[PDB]
Symmetry: none
DNA sequence: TGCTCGATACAATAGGCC
DNA sequence: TATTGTATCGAGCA
DNA sequence: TGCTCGATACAATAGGCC
DNA sequence: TATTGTATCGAGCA
């Protein structure tokens, strides 16, 4: 019941820490904010413009807001990170590509529209930390920024309150009427996403399933990274997906299937749950086939950020 | 440099967790309180009635208030701790006696008179966690108890606000005029506690130091546990300290030495700093000699909780 | 190449922090005069006393089961956890206090039953007056002579197998042999190696035990033979008796029927700390068969076979 | 008390080790050689061709032979030791100038006519790679060299066996008739060395002693380094001692005393014991006054290495 | 239908590295 | 991290 | 000088983490 | 990466 919320919060604030001042700053933001109708995520993997994998310290999905602790390079529990400058809206802390290759299956999202606030814990680093008065000031301004964000969304009636029990349940989206990219939709299994579009399934094996009420649309469950069978990628923008095969012959023979098959795909990408290391499937949008190269394989572009959902037949 | 405060706070809330719900409860208490005139300590070692060594998750020394998270029983392997029942005002979590004699060097205080507030994190135990609203309520009432204790202290004019810069500097205690147990006075070395009483000392490596302004008292820096040369103990309430030695012969030769004088000793116990593991010296009181013997041998009873200080002597 | 492993080994063995005053001289002299590096040796070897305290010997030849200990009565050592005491003749005169014995539980601690101990008395008489180098060199020489006679006693029986660093921790050595014995003093770097002696292809193994692929009645087991948070396990000083219990009695009641009808034989490799460099290693204790379950005291595994047969990968 | 032997031997072989292979090589040499009629010293401080202070790992005084192990730059237990190249028979391991400034008082000798043998741990001239057995071969060769040296001296009857009990006793020296550098003589105190020349002293506190049996000689107990009162030096060959004062007034007022004073001095320098660091007095030689000036001070040249002794009068 | 087996999901953790 | 056992659901076969 | 030990510096190893 | 174990420095004292 509510205990699920309790456990979830505890676990998010109980991760092994990457930065020295992370735990303090995030815990103070959460506790002072004191709004648990707001879902948050800690150590959220994101993808930068340059395709390197990064992360942010605290992430509110509903508001599209990130919060990042700036310690500079010196003090890091993980020497597995690196400190660089990037686009204004992108984090300063990155993962080395060597271990970003083992982080493929992890849940990695797109920050394009999102805002990032920084907390500066060092006055004239290296060395001396800033006084707590300043840090508390930054944290307070951030907190009220968050609050005004939430109020802006409720005023636009685009804000859906967070419920643990209903969020992984297909019926809630069937009732809602749409699965939206902005509602941050992730479902526990393939059978569930199938059951949003009119299937009734005990469970589902396949890597794709035909959409019942649209013949030109295919429900797709790809790994958006490279695996043994397929080499797939998705741009930081979220707009461009490429689909190729580790064997070129399979690609060449997939050309015909792609051009003559369903031209639209509803994509649910397989991602590891950030807690509990488990299979999950996140809604990436409605994509339309564009062209099939032999070299670059298949290229799908995203026409829609929301799809209509249906009751079973 | 107000950065010392920041470092201190970060490191107190940055300890490796003993309990699963510890970080949450403590961090929320601190932030929602957010009064930093209040000094606090996490994972404070305490000494129960029995000789067993226990610990509390959050501790305010100025108010004599502890906060313990109760989960009881699962303690997140793999901890050296154990879940037991004890005196009403004492913690539920203790350490195995085997691991207790390992931790002797640690700074272990007396909880006599201190209040302990608990936070119950499980509705149906074992297993299921409770709802956040309830936990938050428990924490809120604890915060109110803290604030009202702070108020009953400030209005009685017994409250001394916390300062990092001045608390380890002897000059401030010379200016204050006294050193008390309520003040919770711990100094970083022997030379400082010596310089409190009128010494100019640059370094002091000896165990005892002759009191400049009083010839019946001795400044003492004992280890209150067993070590290489001699065996010392202190009662859980901090009333009585027993002095002995490994060799019975040197106890015999030191027996007459004890019997003639000096008959009083002001005590600072050598204790490891709760942060950064270096030696420090904590005022235990002003103690008086009651007895000579074998075995338990010398016995020092505590007759005073406060000692006056003195300017350097030239 | 890789003949530098022997160098590093010898340097590090003769290079430990000294436990005694005269240890280094005696041991170094013995090694250098012996000049046989086909004989593996160990310094400061931890041994299991019948009194159950931990003791140590200054020099240990495993292949010969022969120890050498230097006798300097009492005092002459400053500030170590060691203690002088009397025991059985074939047991050392130096031990660890029970308090620090339980802190050393994880270390490699061996049964000395059957092993002979030679002593070197370095003082003519008490007070620390040293004995002239003449009779000391005499003692060392007769010791070395006895050592060579022992090695000769083994080589004519074709029991003796020369020492090789590169092949001693390699499973394939013992698969070719094809037996693992106590006489060969076998210890492996990891569980997966142990499993790959008996017919497994494992790349890595994190599990507490694995079924014997070619024997349905036998289980490969990697116990901690001391107490930890999950289990309470003991092994007799002669290694003939191993007791297994669980800290919790609910875990305990669940394991009784599992044991009584489960596989009745266990090939045991105990988890021990490396004597140099402190990494986990696994020492073959024997093949034990289940003799009992009495539920306050847990399972009793008695030692039947001192040798086990290996197998090429399946 | 033949125990003093064993205590000396274990205390020499039991010093805090400077080098990684030092213990093994030295111990193997000593135990395999097995000749305790030969006095030896470990970590013996020496003075190089330059003013710099070096050390050798093993030293046989009687034979004038040193033994040094070469492990090179790294594997240093002491970070203040340096690795360089120097004169033909000179050690390769030195001490930093400032860290040798606290080492002034140590017993530092002249290596001029001394042979130094190196154990090459890693590799040797002509370039061959080595470990273990090759090291052993080197050690064995060295042992042989030592023996042939001893025999060479014992056939010329220049060899004198080591006895720990009498060697610090003035009586043996007043008995054999001569104190010389060949015997490596250092006593425990000033009263002893004075009693060697015929004084009866129970206790002697003074910087110099007028010789009973010669009016032209002066027994002297200098610190051959710089201290608060004096600036004194001695050349690496041991042939030249310079004496100056901290104050110039004292120097000028000592100039007349030098030119008109007794013009030859018997020098016993004040050096710390290599074991226990007690003050002891080593015989440098019989030096004759040569020259003086303000600018660099007084200059003494060594005329003779053998002084006659005398019975108390 | 009832059995055998294989792919997938998932929990558990020694080993090695920081 | 990387590896393997255990539990589960479905495909395949008799 | 010569001795004694707390404080300090730095290597050795215990612990956290993937 | 954080804590513990070992060696060195140096003020105070006889």
């Amino acid at each position: 019941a509510s205990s699920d919320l309790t456990d979830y919060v505890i676990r998010q604030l109980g991760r092994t820490k990457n930065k020295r001042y992370e735990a303090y700053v995030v815990s103070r933001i959460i506790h002072l904010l004191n709004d648990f109708t707001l879902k948050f995520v800690t150590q959220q993997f994101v993808r930068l413009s340059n395709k390197k994998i990064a992360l942010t310290d605290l992430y509110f999905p509903q508001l599209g807001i990130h919060i990042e602790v700036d310690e500079g390079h010196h003090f890091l529990r993980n020497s597995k990170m690196e400190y660089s400058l990037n686009q204004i809206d992108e984090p300063l802390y990155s993962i080395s590509q060597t271990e970003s290759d083992a982080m493929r299956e992890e849940d990695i999202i797109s920050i394009t529209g999102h805002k990032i606030f920084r907390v500066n814990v060092f006055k004239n680093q290296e060395g001396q930390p800033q006084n707590l008065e300043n840090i508390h000031q930054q944290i307070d301004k951030i907190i009220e920024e968050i609050k005004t964000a939430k109020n802006k969304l409720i005023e636009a009636s685009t804000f859906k309150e967070w419920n643990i029990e209903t969020e992984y349940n297909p019926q809630t989206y069937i009732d809602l009427g749409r699965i939206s990219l902005a509602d941050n939709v992730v479902l526990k299994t393939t059978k569930d996403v199938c059951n949003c579009f009119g299937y009734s399934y005990k469970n589902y094996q396949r890597g794709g399933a035909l959409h019942p009420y649209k013949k030109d649309t295919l429900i797709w469950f790809p790994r958006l990274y490279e695996n043994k069978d397929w080499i797939n990628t998705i741009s930081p923008d979220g707009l461009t997906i490429t689909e190729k095969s580790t064997d070129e012959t399979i690609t060449l023979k997939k050309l015909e299937e792609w051009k003559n098959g369903p031209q639209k795909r509803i994509v649910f990408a397989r991602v590891k749950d950030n807690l509990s290391s488990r299979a999950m499937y996140r809604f990436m949008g409605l994509y339309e086939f564009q062209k099939a190269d032999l070299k670059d394989g298949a290229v799908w572009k995203r026409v829609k950020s929301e799809v209509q959902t249906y009751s079973p037949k």
